[model samples]
Target: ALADISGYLDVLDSVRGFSYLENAREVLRSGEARCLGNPRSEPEYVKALYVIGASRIPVGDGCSHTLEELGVFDISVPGEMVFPSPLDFFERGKPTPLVRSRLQLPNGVRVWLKLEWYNPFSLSVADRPAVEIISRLSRRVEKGSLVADATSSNFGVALSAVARLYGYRARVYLPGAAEEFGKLLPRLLGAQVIVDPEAPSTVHLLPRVMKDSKNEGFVHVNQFYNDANFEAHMRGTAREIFVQSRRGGLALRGVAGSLGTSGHMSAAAFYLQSVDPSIRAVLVQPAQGDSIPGIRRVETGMLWINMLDISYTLAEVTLEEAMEAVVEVARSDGLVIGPSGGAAVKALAKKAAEGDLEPGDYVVVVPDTGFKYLSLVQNALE
Candidate 1:
């Protein structure tokens, strides 16, 4: 503290016209080291149980337990805060639990939902593409380049958060019709939020935004049009599903999830085709002009119809059905999952009943968390 003050004092004295009071001449109240020695049982006392390496030491207590007596936590990463870059919080995030479903479906078919929303940012599977797209965009772009995208949903929120981490500005092109939380979230993260009038939905709006920002020094982390979107899910989400399920000693029969950009299912299907050929991919969609926020309503001119032809299987669900599943999950597993999750749940439940699923363990990906879409089901739940 004295050295820090002395450096500033020297700089002030060196100036030709500067005049200042000297601290040595003034009878200022001296600061005492009022820390630590106050009271032994005080809250500010430097005492706690910390397991440094293999030794567990309780600093405050006089317990004589040896370091060798403590059991080590066997988690894969072991210690807390695995985030290196904030990007690692999303990508390379510890795989979410592929836990068994409590719901009993047709003929002893067991279903497992891989809670993808359990990511570090609490983001959906979109973080796979969000990380992949942004990291690749940052590699060649100039320092502090604006990372831009059009999103009226989860990917927009995910991308906006990622841009802030990588020392870049995010500009999200949001549809005017999006929910209030959707609009506020990106802006809260300091992204330049542009809202288009309600004409074309986000599916079409993003492609248009990509073109306009090209000459404006804006690097587009184009989740919709870019192949990187699919690549992100294939390598990370799919591989984790395969590895995590296998490690859990569950025979992974297949995977099921909803589609928004069609990127997620496409990527999952692509990877399943390569490594786990027996594993099938089920794509779920909401009905025409429906209220499923995260998943796309394809009857309104959605893209990538042929994106997942290899492992393509289709199932449909209604908003009402999704609402029930949302309430069901909230009641059963205590998960307030979004409509997209419920839509996928509805689809997967159908596949299990119809004998479409491969007769073993199937995994479901819950795209985003529930708070974002609670308004949609608030009255219904009550």
Candidate 2:
């Protein structure tokens, strides 16, 4: 008989809510379950880390029902959990227009852009981590408390949106060097803005906010390494793509998307591969100044707990290359996708040119849209 191990360790029994099978039985038996001793040691515990960088909020039962009608998988995690919804808004009768403008290269090759600017939320979508931060903060607030976060732009928008809904004050700390639109949009959503004089980096703002607030009961919504960020995409964007592909008769051979925290690409890639093994995943990273380039090599620190089949890296495309692709997308398909979205399209275009993508074979590129970067277009001529 195995010796009772109940008295060997101290356990906190006050926790409540969803219970796992092992935990439920442990509670019922009122004793710690003995581990089956084996000389063969278990494999080292692998900690699966994911970053909650996109802020997605649940719209309500209506959206859930809409998703169901569209054949999206539904879960009961309260629909208001805000995250980036990749569906762009299209006028009543346009079948999700793809940009097809022609950008003439010096060598005589023409590149095209697929505009993602028509996203449903327009420019109001939040980063996934920012949304999760607000959700977590909202639950912890004791009513009328302020929520704060240090972000570039996307997180600021997300927190402001959530705070407005929950009736909490939102304070966002942004880098002074951040683009004007990045700073202004959060304020437009009714958040108090704090501009740090230092340049932008995750390390700079965290300490500044901690010292300034110093126990004001202000909950800080940390976005850098949150699991909720990835989970939001896994349930929303990834699932939606699956539904959209099947409904549209799109035969997807590969999925391509820009890698930020790698959550979007990871979730989409994982789900698509799970459904079909032959599908390939292509992750794109910035040419330079990228902290986490999941495309070059799988960085354990930034890789999500999802499957990644293949990765392709771009050193940096000349502005001529990028702009050519952007213009082509606008002209050919009349679509305007954001830079990140543009990057994915450029990647797909390159593959198509190389004959890696057969003419009839379909490739789904996750274009995040162009609304938030309105300034980029406004300043392009200058």
Candidate 3:
């Protein structure tokens, strides 16, 4: 297995003063890999890395073999970029891959999936806000303080994990016992999971979380009201996409995203629009009387949606439509994106079906994988 390993190296002792990526390229320039071909500039290298990163290979039969010697083009090495700790991994591992999809779309349109599950947690894009919210709080609070919030699953798990990393206690309140998986993950991450058995939805638990934070003297990561969520997406998610798209030599014409806190979608639209006003933004949501995880209806109060000038009114996908897109994307693209992502795909497809989008590159924000929503998938498919 070690003999079959070939991957990017972030740090090379022989090239000490250079940047991590430059060090890796320097090694490849003269090393055994040079037999393959000299790597292009930094922009091209980053794009190449994302394209082949998940294909094959391992590291450490001395990390010396070339791609041809390893018998593979490239592979996601076990530890390509070494970090000092889990916290460092979480903080530094970024710009989670934006990969070109294999799916065929109408009108010569191509779709790119901004796969956020590449996050260290391997959960969702919610990790961005979770880290941002807690990290900002660190400036005002001391270690071992309590942090509280109300979440369905992803944010709570991420928050609990971040809180634990910061040496703080986490208390996450869930809407009800029906969201049992939501309760499970945060607790496993060392949070005090509180289920409001009678609460109708996650939104209802906010009051309870607020009251508890007041009484318990803990910091409440009020995601709905917090500017950190918006800033996180602006600084990280949107900016990364713009740069990656530019580097990949593709003009990003549109973005399709389901609104959770409306953080990523709004911030992406705002930033991308600032860069190129012609870039289109499409909103995906559950059709009326339908439910989906990780995204909510605008009627439920989106803090940032009111601020952005979206081109499309809204593209609503029913649970069945979203799930079908999930299966379609998995079968065609070989990816298991969650319903929110599926909804984005369907939303864009629906637009294409109606001859709305011009032929160009579009991005779909895939918040997470479908692994955590197996039962939901089964239920929808039924």
Candidate 4:
């Protein structure tokens, strides 16, 4: 097994603990024993490492051989990136992954889940933009300058974590009722958390509050309305899906994402559409109104992006469906994915059930892990 191993261990060093994905990897990783290659880069070494990881085999030891020596291309440890630089953060691209789904549908179509929860700090994709937004401005902005932003714990934690990383003082303005983990994390990361009375407890006003909260040297990340948010997804997350799927020999057919800042969905849909103009994009949201915290409805998410081009919408995953899916995935895949992920998967599964798909490989965005929502899933875990 060790002889089969080849490559730099940097990439393999990034896999965080798994609740659901762990088991799924044990099962599905075997299903696709080969591996997904980066179509653009054609990094066979990285693909080799990804395949080895899929086999549930140990990756490599830096002391024994380099990751590249073992045919491993690149590995990024989130906790290992350079502090206080968005370039370092952005270059890592959250390093999220695409995993084959063991969840079955009637047809022969394949489902791939993009696990964004694997992000280094909070295990969510929110930080992808957080790093980009701040990194782009760091040079012009003075060090020790206060960085302000509004968040509902998701983006707030990400933004705060990045701000602290690059030496900027972070002030996160979240909804007054934000949970302990959301609030607690920002502070633990050395950011100041403020309960904004002016802004509702939502991502909608985070941009505005950040802009307004700015004092003399302060800067606002403005992720909500910022073009950079969606742009980041377009350049980073969205492209990775296509590249990875292509390498896996999966044609990009159905693509789905639950909207938050609306960045991931919009960017992914736009890019996938450009790739094959005929691709269908599914917009997922919690079936119950306001039931899911991170995702948005078409109406609520309208302003998240200036314009969004969606082929169809799957806003029918009930709270039960979401929770059940999350638990089922955890038990089956050891993923420990959150409800937002459950909602996305449920949405894509429903689309498949309706025969709305064109019959090829499809990918859905799994935004975060249930690490923050452990209480909500604790009963199920027990």
Best by lDDT: 3
Model 1 stretches astray by more than 4 angstroms: 1-76, 79-85, 298-309
Number of colliding residue pairs in each model: 0, 40, 1, 26
Could you report the Cα RMSD, in angstroms, for every candidate shown?
18.4, 11.8, 11.4, 11.7
TM-score of candidate 4 relative to the true fold: 0.72
lDDT of 1 by residue, 229-283 (tens): 6645644566567556656888777778887677767656654554456678777
Q: What does candidate 4's lDDT look like per residue over 282-311, in tens digits? A: 777666544665765666645433454435
Q: If both were scored by TM-score, which would come out higher, candidate 1 or candidate 4?
A: 1
Candidate number of the best TM-score: 3
How many clashes in candidate 1?
0
lDDT (tens digit, per residue) of candidate 2 on 263-358? 666666665665565666655545554332112223423546333442343323433444455555656666665655556666666765665543
What's the lDDT of the predicted structure labeled candidate 4? Answer: 0.65
- The residue-level lDDT of candidate 3 at 360 comes to 93
Residue 21, candidate 4: Cα error in Å is 35
- In candidate 1 the C-alpha lDDT for residue 350 amounts to 80
Each model's lDDT comes to 0.61, 0.47, 0.71, 0.65
lDDT per residue for candidate 3 within 1-382, as digits (tens), equals 2321124322111122213323223333333322223222233332222222212232333344443343322222245787778767765676678888899889777999999888775378988888878876776689999898888678888899988888899988877633456788877888888888898667878887888778889988888877678767865787677667877788789898898788888878866675566788888879988877867788898787775453544888998898998999999888999988899999988887788877899988999888888887788678
TM per prediction: 0.74, 0.62, 0.77, 0.72
User: Given candidate 1, what's the lDDT at residue 248?
Assistant: 85
Q: Model 3: residues >4 Å from true position, as ranges?
A: 1-79, 177-179, 308-312
